[PDB]
Every structure is written in C-alpha cells, then in structure tokens.
Amino acid sequence: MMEQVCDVFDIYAICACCKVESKNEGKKNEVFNNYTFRGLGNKGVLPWKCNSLDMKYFCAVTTYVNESKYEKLKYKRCKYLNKETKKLQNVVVMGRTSWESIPKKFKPLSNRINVILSRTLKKEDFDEDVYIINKVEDLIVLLGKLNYYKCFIIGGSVVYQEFLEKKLIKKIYFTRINSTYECDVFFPEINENEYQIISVSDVYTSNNTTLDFIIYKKTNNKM
Amino acid sequence: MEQVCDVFDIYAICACCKVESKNEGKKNEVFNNYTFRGLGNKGVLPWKCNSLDMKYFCAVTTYVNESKYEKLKYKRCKYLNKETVDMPNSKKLQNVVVMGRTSWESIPKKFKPLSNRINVILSRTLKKEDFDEDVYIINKVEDLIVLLGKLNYYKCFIIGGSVVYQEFLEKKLIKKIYFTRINSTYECDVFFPEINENEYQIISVSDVYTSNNTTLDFIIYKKTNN
Amino acid sequence: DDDEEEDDFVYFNFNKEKEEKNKNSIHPNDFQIYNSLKYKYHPEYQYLNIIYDIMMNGNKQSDRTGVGVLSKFGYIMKFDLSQYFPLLTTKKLFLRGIIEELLWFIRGETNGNTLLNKNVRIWEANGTREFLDNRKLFHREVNDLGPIYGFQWRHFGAEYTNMYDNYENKGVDQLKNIINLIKNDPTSRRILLCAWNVKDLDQMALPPCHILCQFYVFDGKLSCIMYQRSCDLGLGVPFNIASYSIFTHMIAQVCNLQPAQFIHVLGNAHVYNNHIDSLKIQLNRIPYPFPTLKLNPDIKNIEDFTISDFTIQNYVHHEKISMDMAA
Amino acid sequence: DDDDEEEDDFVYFNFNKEKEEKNKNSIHPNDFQIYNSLKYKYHPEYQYLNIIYDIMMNGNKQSDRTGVGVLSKFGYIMKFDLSQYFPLLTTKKLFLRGIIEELLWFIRGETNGNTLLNKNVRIWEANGTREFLDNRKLFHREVNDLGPIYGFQWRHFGAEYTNMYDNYENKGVDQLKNIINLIKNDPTSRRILLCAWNVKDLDQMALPPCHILCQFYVFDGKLSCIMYQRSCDLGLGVPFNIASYSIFTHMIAQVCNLQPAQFIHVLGNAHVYNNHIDSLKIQLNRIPYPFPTLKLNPDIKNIEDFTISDFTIQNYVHHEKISMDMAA
Numbered sequence A: 001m002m003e004q005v006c007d008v009f010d011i012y013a014i015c016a017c018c019k020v021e022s023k024n025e026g027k028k029n030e031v032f033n034n035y036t037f038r039g040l041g042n043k044g045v046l047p048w049k050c051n052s053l054d055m056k057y058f059c060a061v062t063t064y065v066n067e068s069k070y071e072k073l074k075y076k077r078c079k080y081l082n083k084e085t086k087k088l089q090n091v092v093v094m095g096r097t098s099w100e101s102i103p104k105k106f107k108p109l110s111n112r113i114n115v116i117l118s119r120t121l122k123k124e125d126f127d128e129d130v131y132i133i134n135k136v137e138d139l140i141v142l143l144g145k146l147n148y149y150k151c152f153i154i155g156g157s158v159v160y161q162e163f164l165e166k167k168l169i170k171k172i173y174f175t176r177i178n179s180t181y182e183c184d185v186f187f188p189e190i191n192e193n194e195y196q197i198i199s200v201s202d203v204y205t206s207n208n209t210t211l212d213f214i215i216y217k218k219t220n221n222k223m
Numbered sequence B: 001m002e003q004v005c006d007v008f009d010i011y012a013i014c015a016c017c018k019v020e021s022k023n024e025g026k027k028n029e030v031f032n033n034y035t036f037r038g039l040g041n042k043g044v045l046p047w048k049c050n051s052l053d054m055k056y057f058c059a060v061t062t063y064v065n066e067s068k069y070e071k072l073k074y075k076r077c078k079y080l081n082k083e084t085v086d087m088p089n090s091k092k093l094q095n096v097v098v099m100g101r102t103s104w105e106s107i108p109k110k111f112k113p114l115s116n117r118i119n120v121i122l123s124r125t126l127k128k129e130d131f132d133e134d135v136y137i138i139n140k141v142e143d144l145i146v147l148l149g150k151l152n153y154y155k156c157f158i159i160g161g162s163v164v165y166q167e168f169l170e171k172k173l174i175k176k177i178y179f180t181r182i183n184s185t186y187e188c189d190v191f192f193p194e195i196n197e198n199e200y201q202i203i204s205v206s207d208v209y210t211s212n213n214t215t216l217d218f219i220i221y222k223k224t225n226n
Numbered sequence C: 001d002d003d004e005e006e007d008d009f010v011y012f013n014f015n016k017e018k019e020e021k022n023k024n025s026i027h028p029n030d031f032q033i034y035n036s037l038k039y040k041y042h043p044e045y046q047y048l049n050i051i052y053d054i055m056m057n058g059n060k061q062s063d064r065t066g067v068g069v070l071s072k073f074g075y076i077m078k079f080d081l082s083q084y085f086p087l088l089t090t091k092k093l094f095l096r097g098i099i100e101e102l103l104w105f106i107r108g109e110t111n112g113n114t115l116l117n118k119n120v121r122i123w124e125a126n127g128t129r130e131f132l133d134n135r136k137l138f139h140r141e142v143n144d145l146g147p148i149y150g151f152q153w154r155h156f157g158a159e160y161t162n163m164y165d166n167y168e169n170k171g172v173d174q175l176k177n178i179i180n181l182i183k184n185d186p187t188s189r190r191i192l193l194c195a196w197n198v199k200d201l202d203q204m205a206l207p208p209c210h211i212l213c214q215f216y217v218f219d220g221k222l223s224c225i226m227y228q229r230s231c232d233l234g235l236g237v238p239f240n241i242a243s244y245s246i247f248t249h250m251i252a253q254v255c256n257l258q259p260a261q262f263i264h265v266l267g268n269a270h271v272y273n274n275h276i277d278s279l280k281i282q283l284n285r286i287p288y289p290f291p292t293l294k295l296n297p298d299i300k301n302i303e304d305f306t307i308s309d310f311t312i313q314n315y316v317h318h319e320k321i322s323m324d325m326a327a
Numbered sequence D: 001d002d003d004d005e006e007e008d009d010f011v012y013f014n015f016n017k018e019k020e021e022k023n024k025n026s027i028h029p030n031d032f033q034i035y036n037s038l039k040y041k042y043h044p045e046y047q048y049l050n051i052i053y054d055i056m057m058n059g060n061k062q063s064d065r066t067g068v069g070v071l072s073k074f075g076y077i078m079k080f081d082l083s084q085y086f087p088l089l090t091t092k093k094l095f096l097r098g099i100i101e102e103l104l105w106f107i108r109g110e111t112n113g114n115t116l117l118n119k120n121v122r123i124w125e126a127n128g129t130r131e132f133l134d135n136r137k138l139f140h141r142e143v144n145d146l147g148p149i150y151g152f153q154w155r156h157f158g159a160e161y162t163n164m165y166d167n168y169e170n171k172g173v174d175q176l177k178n179i180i181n182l183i184k185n186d187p188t189s190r191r192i193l194l195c196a197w198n199v200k201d202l203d204q205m206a207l208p209p210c211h212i213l214c215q216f217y218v219f220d221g222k223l224s225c226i227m228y229q230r231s232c233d234l235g236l237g238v239p240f241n242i243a244s245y246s247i248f249t250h251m252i253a254q255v256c257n258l259q260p261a262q263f264i265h266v267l268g269n270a271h272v273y274n275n276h277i278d279s280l281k282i283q284l285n286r287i288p289y290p291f292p293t294l295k296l297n298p299d300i301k302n303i304e305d306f307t308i309s310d311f312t313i314q315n316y317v318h319h320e321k322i323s324m325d326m327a328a
C-alpha cells in the first residue's frame, strides 16, 4: 500500500550520546541498558567538548553519496509525488540552537545542503547559503523540490524528539561515547519495539575514551 | 559491439586427467596447464567415473538464476534484431547442453537426455525423426546459434567430446571454460586442445578434494580481451 | 558490471552441505537476535562467534569431568589493546581475583592459602585433600599446589619440595629473562614464557591450561600471543582473555613500551553441556563499548605491582549470568 | 530481508581505513598482477601465499640475528585437510627424503648430526659446526653434537644431557610414547601434547627449537594436530615445516588406528627475508596445481618401525624450482 514519508525521502537521524552524570548513589552494582547512553548536550554545546573520531564519522556519513543509486531514488520520489522525469549531495537538518553551536569556520557544513528549523529567525537573519523552515511539514515539501541523496536529522534534542514522535526516522546512526559527563539535554528513550539494533562497529579510543557506533533500524511495524 | 560467445553465453565444461608417457624423459618431468588433457578412452572416461566431478558437472550445467535472465534476452533479442521468442518453453528456464554423438552414446540410458537441461546433439548422420520433442539435433556448428535464437535458456554449455571442443575453441565461441583437473594418470586416446595462454587465462581455482582415490580441483578459464 | 562471477561463486559451493549434517539440536529461535544483526564488528564477537560455532558445529564428546561437551580444535582471537581493554560485556565479570592470581604467579608462589586469605577461591578446589589424593599426591599438604605457573615462571627446572621452601636462584627465572630480552634484544624470536614443564606435570595439582606466552616488539609496541591447550568457553576463556591482556599491559609498562595486540590461540575449545542454555541467552545480548584499563604509571618493575595499581574504567555490562550446573 | 542502501552502512563502518601511498614496503602495483587478477583463490596453498602477500604488503621492517633484515608479522593460523590431500606446495619444487629422515632421526631420539650427514641430509649441518657451537658458547661440545634438541626431548625430557653417544635408555620422560598411549586409551584427553621447548635445556641446544609443541585432538576415529611455531621463515622453512608435521600426523594416526584429519599450523613470529622478496614475487604469480597424496606402508604399526622406504608421495605436479637465497 502507500508509503510513509521517512521511507520515500530517506530520512535518518545521526547523533552521539555519552553516559549521564546523575550521581548514582550506588555506582557499586548499577544497572545498564541502551538508555545508559543518552547524554546529548550541556549548556548549548557538546558534553565532551570534542571527539575527533566521532566528528570524522559524522562527516563521513553525512557527506557520503553514491550517484549510481540516485536514479532509483529519483524515480521512487517522483512516483510518490505523481511527478516524473551540481554534484549530488545529502541534506542535513538541524535546530536553530544546534546551528549556533557549530563554530563559524564549519558553517554551512561542507558538501551538504544545510536546513535549519526556527521560529524566531528568518532567512533575512542568515548571511549563509542555507534554507530556513519554520515547520517540520515544510521540510517534506522542500525535500520534494530538491535533488539530494539522503536526509540526515542532526540534532538537537528538541529536533530529535519530534522527528521520532512523528515517525520520520528510518534508521538511527548512534555513536556511544563510553564515558560520563555533565548534561542538560538528552536523546529520547528508544522503544525497542519500534527500533532494533542491526549493526555494531569495532570499538575505538579517541580523546581519552572508548566509543563505538551502532545502527538502529525502524522495526518493521507489526511487533 | 557484441559477439556470439558473449551474446549467447556459450561456455565449455570438461574434465581432464594426466596422460601416461611410454617415454621416461631424460630429466625431471616438467609441468604446465597442458599436463592436464586426458579427455577419453575407448569411447568412455579415462577414469571410468568420478562422483565429485559428476556432481560438479550436474550442479553447474543445471543451475539457473531466473532473476537475471531478463538482462540476457534483452541482450540477445536486440542483437537478433527481433523482439522476443501459455507455455513459453515448459514453464521454467533452463540451460542448453551441446554435445557430440559418441558423447551422447557414452551417457547411460538412465541419464539420457540430461534432466532439467535442453539437450542438443551434433550429428551429421542422425535423424531428428527418431528423437523426442525436447531432444534436439543439429547438422553443424553454424546451426546451434540459430537454435539458441528461437529458445529461452539461461546459459549454453558445450559438454564434449574432443572434436566438439576442438572446433568451438578455434571458432572463438567459448567465453569461459570450467576445467576440472583430475590429478592421476590414465590411458587416453582423445584429449582437450592446448589452451592458448594468450587467448584464455585462469581467473579462479577451487579447494582441492579427494574423490574415487584421486585428488582433483576445479579451475575457471576466462576469455581474455585480446 | 561484473555479475558473471556471482554465478561462479555458486558453483564452487556445490559440495557445501545440507541442513541435516550441521550437527546438534539447535532450534531456529535460539539465536534470533544474534542472527538478526547485519554487521557484528565489535571485538566481543570474536568470542561469541566461537561459542556459536561450537554450538552449531561442535563435536559431542565426553571428558574428564563426566559432564560432556561440544568441542572444536584450533581458533585464534585478536584484541587491539591500544584501542580498548577486552573485558566481556555481555555478562558481568570482576577482576580482583584474576589480578591477585597474576600477582601470585609473578611472586612465584604455589601456596593456595595466600589466595584464600584474600578471599580468592580460583584454586580452592584444586588444593583439597580429596583432589590432591586423586592426583596421587598423598604427601602433599592441603593447598600446596606443587610446581605450577608461578614456580615454572621463576624457577623452571628446580626441584620442587614444598610450598614454603626458599627457591632463590634455583631454576630458570623465565620471567626475568623475557623482560630482559624485550628491553635489550627486542627483535628476538625467542621471547617465550613456558609453563608446560613436562618433567613436573604429575607433581602439579593439575597441568597448566595456558601453555605459553610469546612476545613481539615493533616500533615501541608490545604484542603477545598466548597458547591455551584447553579452553572452557563458558567460564574460563572470558577470564583468561582478561588475565593475559592485563599481563601484556604490565610487561609493556615495565619495559617502556605501549601495549598493542593480545593474540589468543585456543587448542581444545569446548562448551560444557550444563552451560548451553546460559550461553544461548548471552549470545542474544548486544555488546557495549569496552572499558579501558589504567595502571599506576609509577610501577617500573614487574614485581612492584599491588592490587591498588589497577583500575578498570567505564565498564558497561549486561547482568551477571550464573553458569550453573543445575540453575 | 532485501535492502539496498544497507550497502552504505558497510561504507560507513570503513570510515577509518588508511589511504597512504607507500604501502609501507616499496611495492609496485604490478608486482602481483597475476596473483591479484584471480577472483576466487580457494586452493589451500593460498593460505601460505596469502600470508606471504600480507607480510610483504604490511610486514614490519626489522633487523635480525643475521643482519639480513626481514618483513615480519605476528600470529597466523593455517589449516590443511589431510583427509583430502597432502599439502606439499606446488608453486615451487620441494623434496622430502631429507625431512622424512630428520623425522625418523627425531623418533629414534637422536642428537647426533653425523647420522644425517652420512645420508647426505644437511638440514642441521650449519648448526653443528665448530664455529656455530663456539658462537653459542658451547666450546666443549663436539662438532655435530647438537645437544638436547627435539629427539632428546621427545624421548628423554628432563634427563641430564652428557654427549650424543651416551646411553639414555629409560632416562627422562618418553613423551612420544605417552601421547601415543593417550591417543589410544584416553582420546578425549585435553593433555595430549608433545613439547620440545625445555626451558632448562635451551642454552645447551645448538639452537632453541622453532617447533614448540604439538597438540593432538581425536574425534570419530579421526586425528587432528596443532603445531605451534615460534619463528617462521616463510620463504624457505615453512614449506618444509608444513610437510614434516603433516607426515608426522599421518604416522601417529596410522599407529593408533585412526584416520588423519587436520594439520593446524600456528605461526608466532612470521617473517620473510629481504633476500627472498624477489623469488616470492615470482612464486605468488604462479597458480597452484591440485595437491599430491601421501601413502604410508600399511604394515607399520609402531611409531618406531618406519623406515625411509615406507613413504610415497603420489601425483606430485609442481612448478619449477626456485632458489630463494639470492637477495635484492
């Protein structure tokens, strides 16, 4: 039957989560689960400051495009919209707060179509080559007009929260930062009946902490 | 451009053992690909039989991938300048196995004509008349290509014997050669031709096995682009 | 486009087997989560994959314990110590005991009471009156384990008397020798620490399972291979990996090198029958990123380490699994 | 479970792979043209060839006791199915009279190098010269008296070594005899090992053993063997080593009324000598022929009764000989 948005437009989420500093009054024999990794940010920035390996991974994933696979996607999207027939690029969607947390020299993110969600700011407030949208619904319309490979939702906490609730995420590229830090915003607790881990990477060390990358896939709808 | 062997996916599959010399050389024997060339003896296999090789033979010649047949006819019909060829041929795709008369004779009646395969013989003396619907017959080499145009098949396998192989090779109709190396010596009267190394090259070698008191392996020769 | 090769791959798999000669009685749902993963690159899968291989293709055999096992012969695992400390995460593991054991080996001890007094019971069962008697060690005091690991590491070749004797300068001090070779003749291919002393096997509470350790040095980095002749996948191996990874870190540190790879070679690898159900549970658990191991940087001699000089950080794990006989 | 872009996931997991140009050791893209042209290399000999290729491409440059220099890697395992073939490398010519005589010499428990020299087997000659012994600080050792090496350890582990002519009957531990009895009477034992690395005797040996130990495994009337090698000269030594222990596995199986299964070779320090690099490039571009088979005289029922004529290598097809000792 008909298809859901997340599928047609290939919308994914990519994030990085650390362990939370809430002082367990019993570090001795505490319980762990996926929810253990949920620290997203702190005071407007990353809880860990910086992690070169995760940054390198985030850059690699959000910039990777495979041109020979686009046509199949072009047809799919066209067919879905009753429509039909530069360098191919991915789309990155972020919240206003996240856009402001990125250092000037990296904005707009290179080789990627930047999209920013905001109500308080408009296109006149930005000097950069970026698209401003004030509604999640507007992102879908835009994707229908753009020529892109994939669309990655890159934060922040408010943005992740609504895309998951609206079920617009097809997969979650989740980095597990295995160390603890002070945090104020978190990734939403993932429902194991809605999402299931399909891949886990090798383990690495970067910036004094180990970390790995896992991929959650939208569990095929009927538990 | 497009060429016959490349269009009709004509491959060769055989088995060759070592051949005994009456002349005990004046030095340590030398080996090369040509060391493996024994094809037959007295109208039969130089080794009587080899269950593993046989299982490989059946497996290869009867295997078909329907999800990829489309690319093939498109490829073919276009070349044929025609478009396509309730039962389009028995309701299930298969391969063609081209063999010679004596070869046809060597096969036991229990196994004749080869199950799940479009059998085809090459005899300038046999009358199609006494053969079933399925078991075809041909006058010459030039006629096979024609029978392939009016058929729905996956791949075409030339399965012997020596004369058949001989010409199909010089006629440059072979794309690949699935060559089984029987590592033991037997008496032979017919042999596979010396593979021109400039024309063909090995692209794959298999694990080594032991079957009916001899070791053997399977290699694959691919038509070089020269 | 190269699709003709795809068909050749199929041909070469012509002799591969059917579903009725895989070996044991495995139910599909037994490993649904485990088999649902697409990419299993986390290093812990080297251990889990071996478990899985023994369960699916192992050989049914009886053994010295009478419990029975599924077994295979010859495996190799590699853990990159520069990137993480390989402490299994699919079940809970504590390291106080195995570290104390390691320090006990380094001191060249053979007195089981030393460990018992620290509440480490790893060697308890092998030192009972009953156990010693079954090995025909009638004249051996309870807990006097004989010329085992520690003894062979510091006094290989010496005549064993009793666990209280002073063995100073008797036998070959292999440990000391390997540290010297790593420091002064790093490219040597003879840096081996061997516990399998054929002459003393019978006097040992039990012959060693970790036969030897061989070291390799390159560009300031130390790698270690340990050969294990008998490996209890469900209970022993997880601890063994941790033991030799810690030992590799210790040896590297006192030799001013950075630890690189811990390579584990398994000879007779087996899974005990009374462990099967617990391992089916463990294999459907997804690993967490490994923790890291920190050593007091001031310790410069292999003999100066104490239990407080070791710290495991960020250990995230699934709950403890009892590997019961009954359950 | 058909998914297209799950292929992209594979690319993602590779984001941290190297991209340099000097693949470490100065190798030209076409040095392995034929080797790299093949699609499927499933012939068992590729386990050896692939290891060589791996060392050449990623080996570590190191100096050695000989000042010849090598490329080395650490830790590999190769497995050969003795029930299907005899793994005698076919990409170069190999002879076996010498390695079999060495095996028989080991089984008799000998340490006398002259015994091999008189049969024109010179495997141990360099290790028994006045110079080599002197260099080992074995000033009081007679030329060719190799010391308590393999044979002595397999038949008299722990016995006090005097000289190669002494009588060691019933002295030390006869390991060979013990593993054979363990294999016959206690096959599920996890202690069937033959060790030559006698720590107490290393310094008295012409040279410490390269083949540390052999562990045996028995199941369903079949015998498997693992041999741990601490130092492996991939170019010259390993081809013979594989052959020696594969034959040895056949011998042990036969005298225990079992069928040989697998010979598993574990390599510790695996290295390629710089002077062997050119010859191995030639060898890696050669395609293996099906392996030969080994036949043992069926009448030999005791490990001690084998003689040189009790062995036969059949259907050995191979490429021409390659002399590895010419550097560059």
Ligand SMILES: NC(=O)C1=CN([C@@H]2O[C@H](COP(=O)(O)OP(=O)(O)OC[C@H]3O[C@@H](n4cnc5c(N)ncnc54)[C@H](OP(=O)(O)O)[C@@H]3O)[C@@H](O)[C@H]2O)C=CC1
Binding pocket: A014, A015, A016, A017, A039, A040, A041, A042, A043, A044, A045, A046, A094, A095, A096, A097, A098, A099, A101, A117, A118, A119, A120, A121, A133, A134, A135, A136, A154, A155, A156, A157, A158, A159, A160, A162, A185
């Ligand atoms: N760990 C990780 O992987 C990541 C962490 N972060 C961290 O998270 C933090 C930012 O988190 P957070 O505070 O949640 O904010 P976000 O970056 O998610 O921004 C949410 C805000 O962006 C706008 N916005 C969100 N949804 C909508 C919508 N539907 N329509 C219109 N505007 C919308 C609004 O902007 P405005 O107020 O204009 O209306 C809203 O106030 C930082 O600390 C950053 O460092 C960020 C990305 C990734």
Ligand SMILES: NC(=O)C1=CN([C@@H]2O[C@H](COP(=O)(O)OP(=O)(O)OC[C@H]3O[C@@H](n4cnc5c(N)ncnc54)[C@H](OP(=O)(O)O)[C@@H]3O)[C@@H](O)[C@H]2O)C=CC1
Binding pocket: B013, B014, B015, B016, B038, B039, B040, B041, B042, B043, B044, B045, B099, B100, B101, B102, B103, B104, B106, B122, B123, B124, B125, B126, B138, B139, B140, B141, B159, B160, B161, B162, B163, B164, B165, B167, B190
């Ligand atoms: N090792 C292997 O893989 C195989 C070995 N063999 C062995 O080889 C032996 C048979 O070898 P061989 O003697 O070469 O004969 P073949 O088996 O190849 O038979 C060829 C026959 O084909 C016909 N023929 C010859 N030239 C042509 C042509 N240009 N066009 C059409 N038909 C032609 C003739 O038929 P007619 O005279 O009626 O006109 C001729 O007698 C047997 O011993 C068999 O067991 C067979 C198959 C495979």
Ligand SMILES: CC1(C)N=C(N)N=C(N)N1OCCCOc1cc(Cl)c(Cl)cc1Cl
Binding pocket: A014, A015, A016, A046, A049, A054, A055, A058, A094, A098, A101, A102, A103, A106, A109, A153, A154, A155, A175
């Ligand atoms: C957390 C990070 C990177 N990693 C993963 N896996 N997932 C994300 N969604 N990421 O952040 C996207 C928004 C913040 O991006 C940046 C933030 C900083 Cl501080 C700098 Cl220097 C550069 C960049 Cl591009």
Ligand SMILES: CC1(C)N=C(N)N=C(N)N1OCCCOc1cc(Cl)c(Cl)cc1Cl
Binding pocket: B013, B014, B015, B044, B045, B048, B049, B053, B054, B056, B057, B099, B103, B106, B107, B108, B111, B158, B159, B160, B180
């Ligand atoms: C040699 C064999 C099988 N193997 C390979 N690789 N290549 C061939 N061309 N093959 O023979 C095809 C012609 C003979 O076929 C048979 C001959 C005999 Cl005798 C019996 Cl019993 C059954 C069969 Cl199907």
Ligand SMILES: O=c1ccn([C@H]2C[C@H](O)[C@@H](COP(=O)(O)O)O2)c(=O)[nH]1
Binding pocket: C064, C207, C209, C210, C230, C231, C232, C233, C235, C236, C237, C240, D189, D190, D191
């Ligand atoms: O550090 C250790 C010590 C023992 N074992 C296991 C392997 C065997 O199951 C049993 C020893 O008995 P034998 O293999 O020696 O028979 O203990 C380990 O895995 N690791």
Ligand SMILES: O=c1ccn([C@H]2C[C@H](O)[C@@H](COP(=O)(O)O)O2)c(=O)[nH]1
Binding pocket: C189, C190, D065, D207, D208, D210, D231, D232, D233, D234, D236, D237, D238, D241
């Ligand atoms: O049967 C043998 C004997 C020796 N060697 C090689 C390994 C080393 O290159 C050299 C011995 O040097 P050391 O590793 O002992 O230093 O001989 C083999 O590969 N196989």
